[PDB]
Amino acid sequence: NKPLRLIFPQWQGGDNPPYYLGSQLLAWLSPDPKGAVEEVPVPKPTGEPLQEENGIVGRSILIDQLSEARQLIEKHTPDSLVVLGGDCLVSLAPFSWLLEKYKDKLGILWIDSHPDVQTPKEYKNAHAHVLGELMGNGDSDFTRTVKHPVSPQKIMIAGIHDPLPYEANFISEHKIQTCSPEQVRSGAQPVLDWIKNEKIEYLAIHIDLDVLDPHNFRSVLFAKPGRGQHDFGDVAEGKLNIPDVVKLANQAASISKAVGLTIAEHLPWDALNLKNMLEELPLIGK
Amino acid sequence: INKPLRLIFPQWQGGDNPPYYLGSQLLAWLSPDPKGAVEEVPVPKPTGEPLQEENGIVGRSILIDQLSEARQLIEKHTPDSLVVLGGDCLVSLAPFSWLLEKYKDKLGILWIDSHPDVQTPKEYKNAHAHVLGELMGNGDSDFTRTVKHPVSPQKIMIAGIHDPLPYEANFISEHKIQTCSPEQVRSGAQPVLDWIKNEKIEYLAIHIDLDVLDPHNFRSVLFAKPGRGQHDFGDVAEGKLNIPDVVKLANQAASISKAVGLTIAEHLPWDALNLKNMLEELPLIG
Ligand SMILES: [Zn+2]
Ligand SMILES: [Zn+2]
Ligand SMILES: [Zn+2]
Ligand SMILES: [Zn+2]
Numbered sequence: 001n002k003p004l005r006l007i008f009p010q011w012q013g014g015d016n017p018p019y020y021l022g023s024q025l026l027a028w029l030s031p032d033p034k035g036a037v038e039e040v041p042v043p044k045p046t047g048e049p050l051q052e053e054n055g056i057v058g059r060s061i062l063i064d065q066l067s068e069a070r071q072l073i074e075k076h077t078p079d080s081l082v083v084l085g086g087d088c089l090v091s092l093a094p095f096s097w098l099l100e101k102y103k104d105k106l107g108i109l110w111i112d113s114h115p116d117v118q119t120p121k122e123y124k125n126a127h128a129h130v131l132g133e134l135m136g137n138g139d140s141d142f143t144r145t146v147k148h149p150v151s152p153q154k155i156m157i158a159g160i161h162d163p164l165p166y167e168a169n170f171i172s173e174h175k176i177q178t179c180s181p182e183q184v185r186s187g188a189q190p191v192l193d194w195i196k197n198e199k200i201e202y203l204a205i206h207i208d209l210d211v212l213d214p215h216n217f218r219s220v221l222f223a224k225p226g227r228g229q230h231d232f233g234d235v236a237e238g239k240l241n242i243p244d245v246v247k248l249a250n251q252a253a254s255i256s257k258a259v260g261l262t263i264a265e266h267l268p269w270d271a272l273n274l275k276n277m278l279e280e281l282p283l284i285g286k
Numbered sequence: 287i288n289k290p291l292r293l294i295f296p297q298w299q300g301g302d303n304p305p306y307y308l309g310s311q312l313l314a315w316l317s318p319d320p321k322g323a324v325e326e327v328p329v330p331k332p333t334g335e336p337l338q339e340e341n342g343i344v345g346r347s348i349l350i351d352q353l354s355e356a357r358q359l360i361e362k363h364t365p366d367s368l369v370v371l372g373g374d375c376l377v378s379l380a381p382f383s384w385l386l387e388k389y390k391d392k393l394g395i396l397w398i399d400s401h402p403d404v405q406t407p408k409e410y411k412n413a414h415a416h417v418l419g420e421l422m423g424n425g426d427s428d429f430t431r432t433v434k435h436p437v438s439p440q441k442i443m444i445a446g447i448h449d450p451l452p453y454e455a456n457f458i459s460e461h462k463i464q465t466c467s468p469e470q471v472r473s474g475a476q477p478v479l480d481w482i483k484n485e486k487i488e489y490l491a492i493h494i495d496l497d498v499l500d501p502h503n504f505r506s507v508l509f510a511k512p513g514r515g516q517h518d519f520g521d522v523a524e525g526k527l528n529i530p531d532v533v534k535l536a537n538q539a540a541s542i543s544k545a546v547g548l549t550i551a552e553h554l555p556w557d558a559l560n561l562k563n564m565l566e567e568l569p570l571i572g
Contacts, residue, residue: 003570028315029562030571082571205569216512218505219557225503242560246567253569261570270506270555273529275316280533282492282540283548284292284369285318 003035004078006094009042010065012058013089013127014221014265017045021275022219022266026084033082038072040065040090055120056139062089062126063141069093070145085264087127088116091206092142095134098204098260099148106259107200108134108150109191109252110157111245112208113236115178117170127265131155131206135174152176156194158184158248159211162236181239188248195256204260205249209267212238212245219268290322291365293381296329297352299345300376300414301508301552304332308562309506309553313371320369325359327352327377342407343426349376349413350428356380357432372551374414375403378493379429382421385491385547386435393546394487395421395437396478396539397444398532399495400523404457414552418442418493422461439463443481445471445535446498449523468498468526475535482543491547492536499525499532506555 009023020042042065053059070093073081079101081094098106110116110131117132120139133142136149143149152174160178163171171178179190194200214223214237222237252258278284296310307329329352340346357380360368366388368381385393397403397418404419407426420429423436430436445466450458458465466477481487501510501524509524539545566572 005571025558026561026565028312029558030565034571080570207568217557217560218510218512219561223505225505242564246564249568258569261568263565266561268557270504270557271312271316273504274313274506274553277529277533278313278317278550281494281536281548282545283290283367284550286321 001080002076002078003080003082004073004076005033005035005037005082005084006069006072007037007039007084008069008086008090010040010086010090011042011045012050012061013125014087015050015057015125016087016267018267018269018272019085019087019265020045021272022268023084023086025268025271026263026266030084036076036078038076040069040072052124055124056126057124059141066093066142066145073097080259083262085262088206088208088264089127089130090264091262092130092133093145094262095204095260096146098202099134099146099150102202102259103148104151104154105199105201106150107154107156107195107198107203107256109203109205110155111159111206111211111248112157113159113161113211113238114208115157115160115163115167115171117167122166153198154200156191158188158191159240160236161239164235184240184244184248188251191248191252192255195252200256202259203252203256205252205258206262206264207245207249208265209263210238210265211240213241214238216241218270219266221265221267223269225269288367289363289365290367290369291360291363292320292322292324292369292371293356293359294324294326294371295356295373295377297327297373297377298329298332299337299349300412301374302337302344302412303508303554305554305556305559306372306374306552307332308559309555310371310373312555312558313550313553317371323363323365327356327359339411342411343413344411346428353380353429353432360384367546370549372549375399375493375495375551376414376417377551378549379417379420380432381549382491382493382547383433386421386433386437389489389546390435391438391441392488393437394441394443394482394485394490394543396490396492397442398446398493398498398535399444400446400448400498400525401495402444402447402450402454402458404454409453440485441487443478445475445478446525446527448526471527471531471535475538478535478539479542482539487543489546490539490543492539492545493549493551494532494536496550496552497525498527500528501525503528505557506553508552508554510556512556
């Protein structure tokens with residue numbers, strides 16, 4: 001067995017500098033690694049704004065980091081991947097690798113308030129594109145790297161609620177299964193039935209931390225200090241708590257072999273503000 | 287030459303709250319690189335075994351041992367300045383006592399806190415509420431006996447304090463301790479600047495209790511504990527300042543006096559702790 005942990009502090013897919021610290025802090029908080037560790041080279045945020053590049057903010061650097069993530073994976077030819085992001089787009093190369101290795105026996109359990117199936121026609125921040133790209137849909141600079149696109153029947157989106165009209169149509173068109181926060185709480189029966197009926201032997205788990213209720217976990221986008229009610233376009237916000245997500249992941253991993261785990265979209269507002277405070281205070285560091 | 291010392295002091299027993307330990311380690315990781323020497327006070331990690339009240343003080347004996355060891359580490363370096371990454375507020379006892387021995391009545395103590403920390407075991411069993419009084423030579427003899435040069439009360443300024451308890455209002459009045467309210471801080475901190483000028487404060491020790499911060503905007507303090515109710519903390523005063531107010535205040539004061547001490551205390555990073563435990567419990571990484 002050969003696991004690889006990828007520290008992937010990508011922040012450009014969500015155009016939000018604090019993802020970088022969020023990935024480094026996630027890495028610091030994590031248990032000791034079981035196998036190999038690599039960090040994907042990501043330029044630190046400098047305050048210079050990213051620009052839209054043919055409909056995608058930061059297109060060029062995202063393609064570079066996607067290429068470098070794949071190179072680091074190939075270097076270790078791992079059978080399992082833990083990805084410490086970073087915005088949701090960090091899962092593209094890791095889950096593409098797992099699709100090449102495990103093919104139609106892989107299922108993708110996408111734990112997110114949102115389905116991440118938009119394209120640059122709908123949204124300029126690429127962290128909303130990644131699950132669609134794993135199906136081979138969307139912007140070809142990204143889908144060209146996906147050699148074994150996942151069937152929509154081998155996806156389960158858990159924690160999703162109140163989807164946008166585009167997203168509900170996409171989910172409906174492609175027959176993609178979902179599992180609401182309510183059904184996660186009541187035992188995640190759709191996830192168990194899906195693993196059995198779609199013969200999911202290997203499992204890639206993506207945890208977008210914004211599946212979590214921001215009232216109880218305050219290091220996600222929707223817990224940004226000083227926010228107003230409509231600051232995020234009234235898109236869906238998290239309704240699960242950490243024990244719900246842990247239980248769901250362990251339920252699914254008990255009836256299939258977990259080979260992927262991504263933790264994405266950590267936005268540690270307190271740690272960021274504390275880091276900046278210490279930099280600005282007298283004496284310390286000076 | 288000037289000899290600085292950074293003291294990492296993950297004491298959690300003074301506030302009887304295990305997450306202070308992680309709070310100190312995280313603060314050390316978030317801080318800029320140290321300029322001089324670094325020591326870490328050995329503190330036993332919380333084991334879940336509850337601390338006991340010992341003659342009116344929770345965890346009395348281990349707090350005395352940690353005080354003695356912190357003093358030893360300071361005297362090993364005989365530093366001219368000290369940065370203390372706590373830890374509950376009691377971590378400032380040995381560092382500020384040393385600074386008082388060195389700088390004597392030329393030192394002012396700027397205590398940035400929602401609370402004055404002048405209680406004794408008669409009022410409160412958690413020793414983090416005792417430390418400023420002990421620096422004045424008041425209170426429990428196991429702690430005051432270590433303070434060779436007690437600070438005179440006119441060389442104290444408590445900034446960010448509001449709505450004190452009756453015992454504390456009487457203590458402050460009887461000893462003529464100067465204060466500065468959150469509102470006065472936001473309007474320019476005129477009481478603090480006046481105090482530096484009028485008392486001719488030449489050297490400055492700054493204690494920052496992070497619970498001076500409004501828990502609505504900084505969520506890593508006691509009063510931002512997820513799921514709290516309104517009266518869980520006895521309706522004691524809660525923080526009203528924001529991080530930019532504290533940074534400005536500290537830099538105002540250090541612009542007209544020589545900063546020789548800085549303590550950052552009472553960090554309780556609820557999100558980091560909850561994420562750390564989540565990762566330990568998840569498949570593949572846990
Ligand atoms: Zn996502
Ligand atoms: Zn999301
Ligand atoms: Zn305090
Ligand atoms: Zn306090």
